[PDB]
Design an enzyme around this catalytic site. Sequence first.
Site, PDB file in Angstrom:
ATOM      1  CG  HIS A   1      49.783  38.501  48.288  1.00 38.97           C
ATOM      2  ND1 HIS A   1      48.964  37.575  48.895  1.00 38.97           N
ATOM      3  CD2 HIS A   1      49.161  38.856  47.139  1.00 38.97           C
ATOM      4  CE1 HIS A   1      47.891  37.381  48.147  1.00 38.97           C
ATOM      5  NE2 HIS A   1      47.986  38.147  47.075  1.00 38.97           N
TER       6      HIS A   1
ATOM      7  CE1 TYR B   1      43.896  37.880  38.804  1.00 39.59           C
ATOM      8  CE2 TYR B   1      42.789  36.500  40.440  1.00 39.59           C
ATOM      9  CZ  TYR B   1      43.454  36.633  39.226  1.00 39.59           C
ATOM     10  OH  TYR B   1      43.677  35.531  38.432  1.00 39.59           O
TER      11      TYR B   1
ATOM     12  NE  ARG C   1      40.627  38.945  48.135  1.00 38.94           N
ATOM     13  CZ  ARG C   1      41.826  39.057  48.699  1.00 38.94           C
ATOM     14  NH1 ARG C   1      42.889  38.470  48.162  1.00 38.94           N
ATOM     15  NH2 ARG C   1      41.952  39.737  49.830  1.00 38.94           N
TER      16      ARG C   1
ATOM     17  CG  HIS D   1      45.385  41.806  47.513  1.00 40.66           C
ATOM     18  ND1 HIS D   1      44.574  41.720  46.401  1.00 40.66           N
ATOM     19  CD2 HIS D   1      46.119  40.667  47.528  1.00 40.66           C
ATOM     20  CE1 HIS D   1      44.810  40.583  45.772  1.00 40.66           C
ATOM     21  NE2 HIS D   1      45.744  39.926  46.435  1.00 40.66           N
TER      22      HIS D   1
ATOM     23  CE1 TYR E   1      49.347  38.716  42.876  1.00 43.74           C
ATOM     24  CE2 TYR E   1      47.053  38.514  42.162  1.00 43.74           C
ATOM     25  CZ  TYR E   1      47.985  38.800  43.149  1.00 43.74           C
ATOM     26  OH  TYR E   1      47.549  39.149  44.403  1.00 43.74           O
TER      27      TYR E   1
HETATM   28  C1  LIG Z   1      47.138  36.306  44.833  1.00 43.52           C
HETATM   29  N1  LIG Z   1      47.551  35.243  44.814  1.00 43.52           N
HETATM   30  C1  LIG Z   2      45.351  37.141  46.791  1.00 46.28           C
HETATM   31  N1  LIG Z   2      45.075  36.634  47.784  1.00 46.28           N
HETATM   32  C1  LIG Z   3      45.138  37.807  44.348  1.00 47.61           C
HETATM   33  N1  LIG Z   3      44.083  37.492  44.030  1.00 47.61           N
HETATM   34 FE   LIG Z   4      46.523  38.078  45.648  1.00 46.16          FE
END
Ligand SMILES: [C-]#N
Ligand SMILES: [C-]#N
Ligand SMILES: [C-]#N
Ligand SMILES: [Fe+3]
Lengths: 202, 202, 202, 202, 238, 238, 238, 238, 238
Positions: G160, G145, G155, G158, G106
Site C-alpha cells: 500500500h 492475503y 489479494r 501488494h 498484517y
Molecule cells: C490491507 N489492508
Molecule cells: C489490501 N488492500
Molecule cells: C490487504 N489485504
Molecule cells: Fe492490503
Amino acid sequence: ELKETPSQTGGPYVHIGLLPKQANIEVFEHNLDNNLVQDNTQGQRIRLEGQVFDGLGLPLRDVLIEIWQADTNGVYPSQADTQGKQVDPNFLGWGRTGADFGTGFWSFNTIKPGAVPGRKGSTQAPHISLIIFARGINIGLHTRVYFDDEAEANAKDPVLNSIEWATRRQTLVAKREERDGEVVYRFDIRIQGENETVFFDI
Amino acid sequence: ELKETPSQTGGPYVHIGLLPKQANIEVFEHNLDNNLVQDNTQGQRIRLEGQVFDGLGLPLRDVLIEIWQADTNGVYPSQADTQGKQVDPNFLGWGRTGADFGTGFWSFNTIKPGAVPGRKGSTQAPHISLIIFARGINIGLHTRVYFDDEAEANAKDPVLNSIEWATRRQTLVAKREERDGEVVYRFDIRIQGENETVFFDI
Amino acid sequence: ELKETPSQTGGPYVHIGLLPKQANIEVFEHNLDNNLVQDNTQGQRIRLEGQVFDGLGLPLRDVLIEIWQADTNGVYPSQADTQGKQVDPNFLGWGRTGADFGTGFWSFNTIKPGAVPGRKGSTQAPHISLIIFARGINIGLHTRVYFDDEAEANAKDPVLNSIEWATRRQTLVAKREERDGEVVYRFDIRIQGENETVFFDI
Amino acid sequence: ELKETPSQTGGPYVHIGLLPKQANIEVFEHNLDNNLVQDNTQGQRIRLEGQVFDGLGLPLRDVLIEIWQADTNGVYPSQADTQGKQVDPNFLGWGRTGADFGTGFWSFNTIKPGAVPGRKGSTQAPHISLIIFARGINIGLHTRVYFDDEAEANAKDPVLNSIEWATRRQTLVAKREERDGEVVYRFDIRIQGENETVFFDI
Amino acid sequence: IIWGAYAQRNTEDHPPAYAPGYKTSVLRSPKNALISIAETLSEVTAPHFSADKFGPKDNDLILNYAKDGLPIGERVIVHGYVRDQFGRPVKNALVEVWQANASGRYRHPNDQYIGAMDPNFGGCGRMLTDDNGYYVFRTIKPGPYPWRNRINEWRPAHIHFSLIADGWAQRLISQFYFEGDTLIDSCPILKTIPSEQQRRALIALEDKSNFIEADSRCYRFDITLRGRRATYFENDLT
Amino acid sequence: IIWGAYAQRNTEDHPPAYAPGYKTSVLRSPKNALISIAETLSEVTAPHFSADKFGPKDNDLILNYAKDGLPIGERVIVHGYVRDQFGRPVKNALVEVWQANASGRYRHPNDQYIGAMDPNFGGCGRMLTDDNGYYVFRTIKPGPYPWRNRINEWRPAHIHFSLIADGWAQRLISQFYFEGDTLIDSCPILKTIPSEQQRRALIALEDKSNFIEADSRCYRFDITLRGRRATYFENDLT
Amino acid sequence: IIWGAYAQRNTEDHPPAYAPGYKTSVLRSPKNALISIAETLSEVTAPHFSADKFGPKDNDLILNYAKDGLPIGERVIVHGYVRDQFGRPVKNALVEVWQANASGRYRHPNDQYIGAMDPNFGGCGRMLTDDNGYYVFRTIKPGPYPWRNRINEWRPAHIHFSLIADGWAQRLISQFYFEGDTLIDSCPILKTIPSEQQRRALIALEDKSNFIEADSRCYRFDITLRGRRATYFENDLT
Amino acid sequence: IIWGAYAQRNTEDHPPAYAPGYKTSVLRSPKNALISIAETLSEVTAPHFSADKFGPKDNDLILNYAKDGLPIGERVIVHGYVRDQFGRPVKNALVEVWQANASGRYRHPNDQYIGAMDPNFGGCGRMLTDDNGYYVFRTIKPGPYPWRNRINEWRPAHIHFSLIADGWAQRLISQFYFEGDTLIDSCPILKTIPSEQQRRALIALEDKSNFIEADSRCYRFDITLRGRRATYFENDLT
Amino acid sequence: IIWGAYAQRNTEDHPPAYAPGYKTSVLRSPKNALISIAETLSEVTAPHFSADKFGPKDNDLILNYAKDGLPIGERVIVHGYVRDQFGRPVKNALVEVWQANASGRYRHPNDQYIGAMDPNFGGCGRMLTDDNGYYVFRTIKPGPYPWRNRINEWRPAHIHFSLIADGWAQRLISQFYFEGDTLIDSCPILKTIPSEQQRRALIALEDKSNFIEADSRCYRFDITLRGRRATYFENDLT
Ligand SMILES: [C-]#N
Ligand SMILES: [C-]#N
Ligand SMILES: [C-]#N
Ligand SMILES: [Fe+3]
Ligand SMILES: [C-]#N
Ligand SMILES: [C-]#N
Ligand SMILES: [C-]#N
Ligand SMILES: [C-]#N
Ligand SMILES: [C-]#N
Ligand SMILES: [C-]#N
Ligand SMILES: [C-]#N
Ligand SMILES: [C-]#N
Ligand SMILES: [C-]#N
Ligand SMILES: [C-]#N
Ligand SMILES: [Fe+3]
Ligand SMILES: [Fe+3]
Ligand SMILES: [Fe+3]
C-alpha cells in the site's frame, strides 16, 4: 434493414429550437405552443398542469413537454386514424410547452379527449399521450395521463390493466380540480424514487 | 503525456501505514496526528468531530480522515499560496485521524480558518477541505466543511453556489456547539442514501 | 457518387466517326456539319475561320472543331435555357468541322450571337463557345471566341475580366474582315508557346 | 534526427501577417519595414528598387521581399558573425517590403554593404542577400544583389564564379543610377523565361 | 396495404436511461424498467403541420435572424433523407433544428459561456421533408461547447434536431456531429450510445461535390425512423 | 427543382494534358494552366438532336455499310447506361462511335497499315439514349492497331465514342476497351490516366447472359457524365 | 512561470466508486455523481513536511522494527520516480507505505489470519522524494492475503502507498503489485480499474541489474500524479 | 563549440517549385535548377529582434484588435516548440502568424469572399520563442477558405506562420492545419509536398489536457528548422 | 550519491572464450570457468590521463602521420557517445583506436599482405571523451583484411578501439564495422558474439547530415560500458 437513428438528450438549451419565444427569440411568424383549443373547437375546455421532479424531489426547470390526444369524439386529427369518422376540423391534437424557469410549473389549455378504440374491439379510457425531453434524459420518456373522474372507464382500460403492479397505475391518473368555473387536472411526474411515474416503451 | 497512477482502496488495515500508534506500532519517533494547534498557533481553537455512515446508516469503524485548511488569516502554509501574505509560522494546516474502532467517532483539534480568496476576485467562506479513505472506497472522497455561524459568508460562497441542488448545500455545513468553554463543530458524513453528503471531484 | 468517365484523345482518325463525309464514307443520310445558318435563320451571317497551331508553329491537319452559341437575340436553342424568351426556331446553335488535310484551315458559316445574361444579373459580351479534339490532345480544349467590333461589351465581360493576366485576353478576340460583302472573323488558335490561346475548364 | 518543417506558399494575403500597415491593419505599435537607415547609421545611403516578373513578363503585385546585409564595414549585426570586429550599433541589417498593388515596384532605403570574408580566406564582393515570397511560390526564393560599380570585386567573387554559366552571372548585378543627389540601384527579378534570375539553395 | 404497428424499438441501438458518465442522468433516469405495450391508434397516429405556416427563411439560419449584416462563421449547407427502418421515405415530416453560434455560444438566457454572441445569428430553423423524404437547410457551423460534467468537458460541434412524422411512436430528438471533429471520441454524451456503428450514424459526412464555389460547404446527413409493418391476416390494431 | 451549375470536373480523375509517354501530346498541350470559370447559361446548355434524322441502321455497324455481303469479324453487341455523377440517367444524349475493322484497319485516308480493308464495313455509328439512359449498337470487334509512338506500339482493341448531352460542360470523347485484352496493360494512351480504378472504368465487360445463341456475343459498358447540383437558396446562374 | 489549475482528473483511468465485484463498495459508494468544481487556492496548495522529522530507518522496513533479529522473508529493494502527468519530477513529496509480512499477515488488531506474525517486522515506512522525484526503501516481500469478498478470495502480494505532494488535488492512495504474480489476473480489487494498461501501471517491475549480490533483489516502480497547467493569459485562480 | 555550416536542405522533404496542381505556380517557378552554394557568413547569420519592441497583446489575436467586443469564433490556444533538426531548441526566434477569421474571411483588400468580416478581429500576431524554444499565442480558429484554383477549391482551415531565427539559411514560411479537418486530404497546396509523413508534420494536434475549462481549447504544434554542424577540424567558413 | 559496485557483466552479451570457429581461440582459452568475485576498491578504481599529454593531431589519423602528402583513401569522420549501461555519460575516458590503411594493410612488422603500404598513413589515434561522453576523430576508411583462419577468410573493414574509464571493471577492447559491409555476415570473429542484436551494436551507422561537403563522410558510433549502482543502505565496499 436499417437501424433507427440513436437518441440523444434534448440538452439544457432545448428551448431555442422548440420554443424560441420562451428564449426571447422572435424568428418565426407562426409559433407552436401549448394551446390546443381554437375558437370553434368542440368539447369541454380543461387545463392540464403539473411539475416534473428529479430523484431528489426537485422540479426540473429546463424540461420540455408535448402531448398528443384525440378530439372530443375520440378521433385523432391524423391520416393514420382508421375509424372512418370525421374529426373536429378545428383541432391539431398536439401541443408543446416548457416548465417555468423559476417555479417549474407547466400547463396546457386543451380539451378532454373522448374514448378511443383499443386493440381487438376493446375501448380505451380517455387519455392524453405525453412525452418529456430534457438535459439528463437520453431518450424522450413516454407516459399517459388518465382522469380520476373516469374511474369506471379506467378500471376497464387495456393499457392500465397491462401494468401488473396495480399500485403503480395510480401514478397515471390526474386529479380534477376547479379554480373558478374552469376544470383543471393536476398531473405531477416523478422520474425517480417513490411514487415514480410509469413510463412506457411504445 | 502520462496517465495518473490509478487509485485503489486504502484497505481494511490502513492504520498500520498512516497511523501506526492507533495500531499499537511504535516505529516512528515523530508521528503525524489530528492536532493542528501548537503552543503559539493563532486563532480560536475549535474541535471538529463526527462520524461516517455507510448506506445502512451504520458508522464506518475503519475509516481514515485528513483535513487541509488555511490559518486564521486565510493563508495556506504552502509555497503554492500566492497571496503574498505571511502565514502563521506555527501551523502545518494539515492533520490525520481515524475513526474509533468501537464508537466510530473521529475528531480534530484545530483552528477556525479565515476566509480564502476565490477565483476572479471572489471570496470563499471559511472552510476546511476534508478527504476520507477506507475499505470499500476505491478513491478518496473529497468534501468541504463549512460553519453554520458563517451564514452570511456561506450564502455568497462560490463553491456552495455551484451546487445547483440547493437542498444538498446544507450537508456541507457543520453545527456549532459548546461543551463547556470550548467550541465544537459537529459534522457527520453520509456516504450513501438520504441526506447523502456532497462529494467533489477537485 | 460516381466518377466521370475518364477522357482519352479523339485519335488520328477521328473523322470516321464524327465527319464520315470528310473521310469519304457515305453511311448516314443526314450528316452533321459546319453550317448553322438555315433559310429562315435570323441575324447577320458571318464566317468564322482560322487554323490551329502546335508548339512548333505548325497547323494541325487532323484537328476536329465544334462550336456552341446562342441565336441572334442571345437565347440558346436548349431546354436548359431559362430566359423565358422564344428562341429562333430555325437555329441548332451547334456545328462541327475539321481542318483541311492540306492547308489546315477550318471554318463555320453561322450567325453573330446576341448578348447572353451573365451570373448575378450581369451581361456577357457576344461569344461562341468552341472546343477542339485531336491526336495528342487528351481532353477536349475549351475556349471562347469574342469579336473585336464589340470592344465596349468585351471590356465589361465577366469571363474575360476573370483572366488576371490582361495580356492573354486578346487571344480570345477574333478579327473582323470583309472578303466582298461577307463578314469574316479570323480566329487562330495557338495551343502552345507565345500568344498561347487561353483555354478554360468549364 | 528530425526533418525540416516543410515549406508552403506565403499565400495571396501574406501582407496581413508580415506588413499589417500595407493591409490597413494597425495592431502593432512598432512595425517592421523597408528602412534600414537610422539617424546615426554609417555608410553611403542607397535606394534599392525594382520589380518581380512572372513567366509572362508581368509584375507580381502580391510579392513580399526581405533583405539581409552587412554594415558599411562588412560586419553583420548578428551574434553569429565571428569577425571579431565591432558592428555599426545603429543598423539592424534586415528589412521587409511589399510590391505596390498597382505598379508592382518595391524598394528599400539602406546602406551599401562593405566586403564580407569568404570561405578559405577569400573576400566576397559587396552584396545583399534577398528572398522573395508570394502566392504561387512554394518555397522562398534566395538570390543575391551585386553592384555594377564593383566590377573588379565581382570578377573575383567566389559565389558569382561558382556559377558555371557565365551568361547568368549578370542577372545578379544591379545597375547604378542617380535621380538627383541620391544613388539608386535598379534590380529587376525574372522568375521564369529569358534572362531568368539566378536563385540559390543556401 | 393495411398497416399494423411500428416495429419494436431496439433498445440496444439506443443509449440506456442511466449513464453515470453523463452526470445529470443520474437523477433524471427512472429506476423502474419501461413498461412495453402493444400499440393502439394513439401510438400509430401523429399531427400534421401545413406548409402554409412556414416562413420563406425558416430553413435558412444564415438569414432568418440577420439584422445589420450576416452572421460570422462557416457557411454550410446540410441536407439528407429521412427514411423509416424499412427504407421507405418519410414524407412531410416536421424537422426542427437548433444550435450554438460560431463561438459555441447559445442564444439562451442560461448560457453564460464567454464565447461571443452574434447579433445576426439566432440558431433555430425548421422545415418539412418533401415526398422523397429529402430535407435541406443552411446555417453557420457551430463551435464546440465547454460544459460542466467533469470540469473540463467539451461537446464536439453539434446541431440538435427533432422529428415529428407519421406515428407518435416515431417521435425522436437527437444530435448530429461533423466528420473529423476530434472531440467526438471523448464526449460522454455520445458515449452513452452502446455501439460504435450507432455512434457513427450521428456523424454528418462532408459532401464535397455539393459544395457551392466561393460560397458554402456541404454535409450529408440521413435519418432513420421506426417503421410500420403491413398486415395480411388478422388486424387487431382495432 | 431549380438547377444550378455542373459539379466541378475532377482533374485527378482524368489524364493530364502533358504526357511525355504519349509523344504527340508534347507539342499539343498548353504550357499554361486551364483557367477555371464559374458557369453561365453558355456552359449549362447544349443542342438537341431529333430522332427523325437518324436512319434505321445508324446503330448497326454490321449492316449500315454492307454492300455485297456481311463484314468479316466477331459479331458483338454493346450496350449500357449513361448516367450523370449523381446517378441520374442521361436522356436523349447523342452517342457517336467509330472504330477500325477486324484487321485493325481504319477506313481513313491516312491509314496505310497493311491490315486488310473490309469492303462491307464502314466503322461508324450513332444513336440517342432512351429515357433510362440506355443505349445499344451492334458491330464487329475491332482488332488491335499498330502505331508509331515508340516504333513497336500497339493500341489494344478499342472503340472510340463521343457524347453530347444536356450541358456543354458534359461534352466528352473517350475510348473503351474489351475485358481480357492483354495490350491494355502496356498502352501509353491508357496510362495517361492517373488511377487504376479510372482505367478500369474504360473496360467493357463480357455480359454472357445477354449473348444471342449462334449469333452474337455481348459486352456491357456504362458511361458517367458530370452532373448538375440543384439550387435551394440564391440562384446566381442568372 | 505562473501556474494555473491541475489538469482534470480522468475518471476513465480510475476505478468507479460503485463496483459490485468488490462487495464492501456497495454500501460505501455515493449514489450521487461527484460535483466537479473549478480549482481555487484550497485545491492547488498542500502541506510541507520537513526532513528533520524523519528517523534514519524510516525507509528501511527490514530494520526499523527489528528487535532480537532480522525479519523472515525475501529481502527486496523498491525504488522509482514520482512525476506529474506532464513528466515533471515531484520534489519533496511525502511517500508512506505499509504492508503485510512474509506470511501475508498484517500487524493489525483486526487481522486474525492464521499466517504467522513476525516479531521483527512492523510493516510501515515513509520517505520524501528527492529533487529528481526519486524514492527508495527496503522491505520484505509481502505474501498474498486471503480475505472474505467471495469466500476464497486472495489479494495478490501488494504494498500500500500514499502520496501528499504539492497540491491537495494530487492526494493519492493506491497499491502496487509484483511482476509475475498470478493472483493479479483474478483479483476483484484490481479489476475495478477499467483498462488493462492502467492495471499494468500498478505492477512493480523486476530490475535485475540493480539486485545486490548475496543480499537483495530489486523492483522498479514509477508513480504519476496530476499536473498543473501554466498560465500565459488571464489568471483567474485568484 | 565552433560552428560550421547549416546542414543541406533536403529538397525531397519540401514541395517542388513547379507543381501544376497548384495553378499559380506554373508561371512563378524558375525553369532553371537552383544553384547550390557553400555557405559563408552571409548564410549563417541573421538579425536580432529585441523584446522591447513587442506590445503586451502581440501574441493574443483574440484581444489585440478587439474594439467594441470580442471576436466571434472558437477560442483556441496554440503552443509548441521550435527546434533545429538536431533537436537543439531555437531561442529568441521571431515567430509571426496571420490567418482569416471564423468566417474564413481575411482582413485584406483583395479578399471579396462573402464570408462575414469581424470588426473585432485583425488576424495577425507575433512573438519570440523563449530559451527552451517554446512559443504560445491565442486566437480564433479560422474557417476554411474557398478559392479559385479549380473553380470549387477550398483551403482547409489554416494559420500562416513565418520564422526568422539564428541563420538566414533557416528562413522559413509555411502553414499549419488542425487535426481532423477533412479538407486536408483534398488540398492541392498541401499535396505539393511529396511525402505523407511531411504533410502530417504540418498538422497541429489537439492537446486536451491543456484545454482551459469553460474558456479555450488547445492545439500543440512543433516546428523544426535546419541546424548547424559543429566543426572539429579545419574551419573554412572563413 | 554513494557508489557501490559495477553491475555484473552479462556473459550472454559477450562472445564465449572458447569459439572453435575462430581457430586461434582453441589454444588461448581457459578450460576452467572464470571465478566471479565481489568487487573491492581495486575493481572500482582506474587511472586518470591528463589532456596535457595529448598532441593536437592525436585524433586526426589523416594528418598525424602525413609526411610528403595526404593518405590515399576515403576521408571519413567518426563520432559518437560513450555511456554506461544506465545511460550516464562517461567523462574523460581514454579512447584509443587503430586500423589498417585503405589497402587493408596494417603498418605492423608481422603483416605481409600484398596490399600496398601508404607512406602517409600510420593507423593509430587516441582522445579523451568530453563531459557529455562525446568523442570524435578523423581517418581513412580501412579496407577489408584477408587472413588465415580458413584459407580464404576476410575480416570486414574494421577499426579497433580500446577504453579505459572510471573503473578497472569497465576495461574494454573491441572492434566496430561500417554499415552495409557484406563481409559482416560471414566473419567468424563477429560470429563469436551469441546474439544478433549485440552484433549490430558493433556497426557504425552512416550519418549523412553530418557529412562535410566536398570533404568527408561521417559515421555515428556509440559505446556502452558497465555502470555502477548507487548505495542507499549498508556500504560494504569498504
Ligand atoms: C490491507 N489492508
Ligand atoms: C489490501 N488492500
Ligand atoms: C490487504 N489485504
Ligand atoms: Fe492490503
Ligand atoms: C445544448 N443544449
Ligand atoms: C447539447 N447537447
Ligand atoms: C484511332 N484514331
Ligand atoms: C485510337 N486512339
Ligand atoms: C492566405 N493567403
Ligand atoms: C493560404 N494559403
Ligand atoms: C450544447 N451543449
Ligand atoms: C486507333 N489507333
Ligand atoms: C488562404 N487562403
Ligand atoms: C585485422 N585483421
Ligand atoms: Fe447542445
Ligand atoms: Fe483509334
Ligand atoms: Fe491563407
